[PDB]
Task: structure prediction
Amino acid sequence: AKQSMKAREVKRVALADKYFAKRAELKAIISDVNAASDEDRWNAVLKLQTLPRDSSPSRQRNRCRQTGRPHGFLRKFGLSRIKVREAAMRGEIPGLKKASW
Amino acid sequence: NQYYGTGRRKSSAARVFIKPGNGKIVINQRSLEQYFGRETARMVVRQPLELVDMVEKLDLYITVKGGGISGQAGAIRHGITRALMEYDESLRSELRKAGFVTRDARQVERKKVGLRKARRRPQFSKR
Amino acid sequence: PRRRVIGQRKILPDPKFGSELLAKFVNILMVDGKKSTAESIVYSALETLAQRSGKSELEAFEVALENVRPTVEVKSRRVGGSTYQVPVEVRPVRRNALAMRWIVEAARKRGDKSMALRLANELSDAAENKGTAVKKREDVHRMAEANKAFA
Amino acid sequence: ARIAGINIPDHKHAVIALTSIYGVGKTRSKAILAAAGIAEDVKISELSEGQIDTLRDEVAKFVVEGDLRREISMSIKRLMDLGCYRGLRHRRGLPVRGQRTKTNARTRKGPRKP
Amino acid sequence: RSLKKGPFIDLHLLKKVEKAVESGDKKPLRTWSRRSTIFPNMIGLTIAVHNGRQHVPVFVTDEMVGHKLGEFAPTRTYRGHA
Amino acid sequence: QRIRIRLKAFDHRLIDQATAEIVETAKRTGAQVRGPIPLPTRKERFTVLISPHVNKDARDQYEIRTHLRLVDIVEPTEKTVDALMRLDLAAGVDVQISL
RNA sequence: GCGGUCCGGCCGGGAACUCAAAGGAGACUGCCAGUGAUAAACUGGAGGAAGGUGGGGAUGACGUCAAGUCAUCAUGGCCCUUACGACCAGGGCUACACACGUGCUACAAUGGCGCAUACAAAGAGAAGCGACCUCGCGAGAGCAAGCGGACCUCAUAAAGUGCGUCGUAGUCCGGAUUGGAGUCUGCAACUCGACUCCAUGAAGUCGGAAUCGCUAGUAAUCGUGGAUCAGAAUGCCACGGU
Ligand SMILES: CN(CC(=O)O)NC(=O)C[C@H](N)C[C@@H](O)CNCCCN
Ligand SMILES: [Mg+2]
Ligand SMILES: [Mg+2]
Ligand SMILES: [Mg+2]
Ligand SMILES: [Mg+2]
Ligand SMILES: [Mg+2]
Ligand SMILES: [Mg+2]
Ligand SMILES: [Mg+2]
Ligand SMILES: [Mg+2]
Ligand SMILES: [Mg+2]
Ligand SMILES: [Mg+2]
Ligand SMILES: [Mg+2]
Ligand SMILES: [Mg+2]
Ligand SMILES: [Mg+2]
Ligand SMILES: [Mg+2]
Ligand SMILES: [Mg+2]
Ligand SMILES: [Mg+2]
Ligand SMILES: [Mg+2]
Result:
């Protein structure tokens, strides 16, 4: 799916764990009300924007791991709907057989 | 002594204990007028003891689980007959012609892909 | 059907009386699976037949059913590009089915407040051989001996 | 008989007939009557001048009548003067809150013109 | 409707305004920030707002305060069908 | 104190020989066993489109079953604890111990 | 079934029953009448939970339409290469005289509203599901245990039943549209989110020619769950009630 689109996903994920899941303190408890309700929170709402436009966990598209498809994704397998069927008929997804109820 | 039966209907399951002598019907620690608000449901639990005359002649201790109102009442009627056939062994051919021994095996059909329901198909247009 | 020909399915009696023709009448009235609400209308309408116009509760429903029953009907029988309306004898299980549907469909297009009162007046009008359920029966019989020559 | 709202309500129940006043819906009508101490199954015939006049004072506290029509037309005139996005949707009869106009804008656009 | 704990503005617009206010106005101030809130500090300024291809000059009146800057630059060209 | 062992697998024949080996083996060195308990079977379901491009109504449906067995041992003698640790069963069977 | 109780399966206890999931049995025209060409086979009866492939699913023969997909992927040929490749901000895919398809909600009394009270199945959960308690009319906020789960949570099933009111009206039917005030997710809610509160209260009174689905736990009607997913279903995939 256009090689550079695969690279956008792998840069976004490296820059998000560079800053966030540690530098969430600016919104984690700086934006909730106690003695920090003065201009310090207002300094946070502005300081949270100078970190790069990436770095946020809500800009990851979650593509398929082999083909890079943006649609038809399944979080349980990490593959697109095409690749889970292509790989389930060969017996390579464990325990995943055809359901009949 | 108690004579036990198991009856089941759509998704309901009923356990039934009968003891000799009373006209007591107790179901889930409630009486019949408090448990079944529907009189059709009231009249299908009385069906097997109206064919066989043990109305003031046999007590009944009932529990039910699952399903809804009419589903639970049908599971009981099936469970009373199994209890009364352990009691006597010769009320069987009386009850087979009443259709109370057949377990009604009609279940909900699963929803199918491409269909709006189990069998309802979406609206077709020629063009 | 062509091949799978059918037995019958069984109806339960009514609880208060023990009649299945009465239970077929509740089935025909029932809308959207609401069976408890159809018995409420059917039970309340029948005793409000009884002491408003004449006793013997369920005898009064069968006698109101005696008049709206058809004996002949028309049916179309195709030949080669010409369809005649041929008068047919109606069968006794089809007699009650057409009579109960015409009573229920007469009661829906009325002007009374409730459905149990619309039912009660249409059943009362059927006992006096009046109303619209009787005239639905009259038009079927008029067309049948109008096409007597195509028998 | 009539309110500060110059309307004339009629003989329904009082919680229902107070909604005849423009600017008063269902929970203002229950709050008006709850503050007057009047039960809601009472019509307006049955209801005194000492109870119609006391109903007028608390209704006279909300912004309920043609004073509210001015404040509503104030705020539309407002948007129509800034030339903002909501003002260009208002002067055009097109839906304002971002609904679909490709199909199904028929309340805001009126009956269709070919 | 953003929640009541902080209105939003960019940093580059926030700082470019405050320097431009203490000097008299100017050129129209070029920005791409359609999402930033107009503040009380900006009454009198002219801000050229991007709309996709152009920058529409908006002279801030008092009654534009509280709105977003993108409301005063239409992004869509449309004039009739027939 | 009863030590409690839960076994998870996608296969029911593999899981029963994992129960049978720990049911074998606590009784090897003399413990109370209740035996195996069937916990409820978890079925995960999946429904995929099978065409690469359109045709919404053509699909395949897959599932994964997860079989559960529970056996508790309330004689944990010290011949048991490391003799329970020296046991080599299959690679499809997840064991989780817990007190 | 017993002992006790706070009268809660609650505690000892029991392994009976429901249930959980492994194994086994059972249905085969097996038995019997009659019909049919000493046939096959058919109609009917008994027993049985089930009777004639018991219900439902998966399973799509040789081929047809040069059917669909070079955009999931792979790949022959051709073409671009300081650009038809790569990075960034803002916009657009949501435009709007109009026409069509598939849906949702309605046009009410077999109903609307108000109070009280019953009976499900199946699914999901760790940068998640999130009880109790407190604040808020509400969406929600604070605090915050339990749960990698037959245990904890999502999570209060709705139609139903009992009582009351409305009394056939553009209505106490309908809830579109618009104004104001908010909540949450997220760098960010203007273009262009969902939801809450107050107000507003459109069309619509059963739909021309035409046309669609369904043979039984089906149609019709009523709620619940899941994937995708920070947020964002009237769609889709599942589950039960009548
Ligand atoms: C929505 N409801 C309204 C109602 O209840 O009447 N039903 C309908 O609109 C369909 C209508 N009942 C009958 C129609 O399909 C057949 N008539 C054919 C006309 C000429 N082809
Ligand atoms: Mg590639
Ligand atoms: Mg996303
Ligand atoms: Mg269903
Ligand atoms: Mg479809
Ligand atoms: Mg009003
Ligand atoms: Mg929208
Ligand atoms: Mg078995
Ligand atoms: Mg038989
Ligand atoms: Mg390019
Ligand atoms: Mg599109
Ligand atoms: Mg739009
Ligand atoms: Mg009512
Ligand atoms: Mg009307
Ligand atoms: Mg009108
Ligand atoms: Mg209303
Ligand atoms: Mg109204
Ligand atoms: Mg989501």
User: Anything to note?
Assistant: The interface with chain F takes residues 72, 74, 76, 81-82, 84-85, 88, 94-100 of chain A (CB under 8 Å). The longest helix of chain A spans residues 3-19. Residues 9 and 77 of chain A are 18 Å apart (CA to CA).
